[PDB]
From a paper:
Alzheimer’s disease is the most common form of dementia and is neuropathologically defined by the presence of extracellular plaques containing Aβ in the brain parenchyma and intraneuronal neurofibrillary tangles containing phosphorylated tau. Peptides between 37 and 43 residues in length are generated, with those of 40 (Aβ40) and 42 (Aβ42) residues in length being the most abundant. These Aβ monomers tend to aggregate into insoluble fibrils, the structure of which has been extensively studied in vitro by cryogenic-electron microscopy (cryo-EM) and solid-state nuclear magnetic resonance spectroscopy, revealing a spectrum of different polymorphs. Two human fibril polymorphs have been determined: ‘type I filaments’, which are mostly associated with sporadic Alzheimer’s disease (SAD), and ‘type II filaments’, which are observed in familial Alzheimer’s disease (FAD) and other neurodegenerative disorders with amyloid brain pathology. Here, we determined the structures of nine ex vivo Aβ fibrils from six different mouse models by cryogenic-electron microscopy.
For tg-[name] mice, which harbor the Dutch (E22Q) and Iowa (D23N) mutations within the Aβ sequence, we observed three different polymorphs. The other two polymorphs, labeled [name] and DI3, consist of a single protofilament and account for 37% and 11%, respectively. For [name] fibrils, an atomic model of residues D1–V39 could be built into the 4.2 Å map. Except for the N-terminus, the fold is similar to the fold of DI1 fibrils. However, although the medium-resolution map allows for straightforward modeling of the main chain, the assignment of the side chains is ambiguous. The presented atomic model represents the best visual fit to the density, and its similarity to the atomic model of DI1 fibrils further adds to its reliability. In this most probable [name] model, the N-terminus is fixed in its position by a salt bridge between D1 and K28i+2 as well as a hydrogen bond between E3 and S26i+2. The second β-sheet found in DI1 is also present in [name]. Finally, in contrast to wild-type Aβ42 fibrils, in which negatively charged and solvent-exposed residues E22 and D23 induce a kink in the main chain, in DI1 and [name] fibrils, mutant residues Q22 and N23 are interior, in extended conformation.
Numbering used by the authors:
A (entry chain D), B (entry chain E), C (entry chain C), D (entry chain B), E (entry chain A): 1 to 39
The structure:
């Protein structure tokens, strides 16, 4: 399996008035935001 | 399997007034936002 | 498996008025935001 | 498995008015933000 | 497994008005922010 074999693009411009934010370049796994119950 | 074998494009412009945000370039797995019940 | 075999791009521009933020380049695992219940 | 085999890019520009922030280059494991319940 | 085999990039520019911050280059393990309950 091959992915992004050459140049790519991604960006977010002029963000404001945020409460919860999560920025990740690469994530080889799991991402969790707001959790209440126990694991 | 081959994907994005050459140049690509992606972006978000002029974001404002957000509560919950999650930005990821590449995610080889799972993504979770708002969760209440336990895993 | 091969990924991002060449140049790439990612960025966030002009962020303001944030409460909770999490920025990661590479994450080979799990990411947690707001958690209340015990693990 | 091969990832980011060549140049890459990532950045955050002009951040202000933050309460909780977490910046990581590489994270081969887990990341926790706000936790209340015991582990 | 191979990652970041060549040049890379990451930075945060002009940060201000922060309460809790955590900056890490590489983290081969776990990261904790605000914790209340005992481990």
């Amino acid at each position: 399996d091959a992915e992004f074999r050459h140049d790519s693009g991604y960006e977010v411009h002029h963000q404001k008035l945020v409460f919860f934010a999560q920025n990740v370049g690469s994530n080889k796994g799991a991402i969790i935001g707001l959790m209440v119950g126990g694991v």
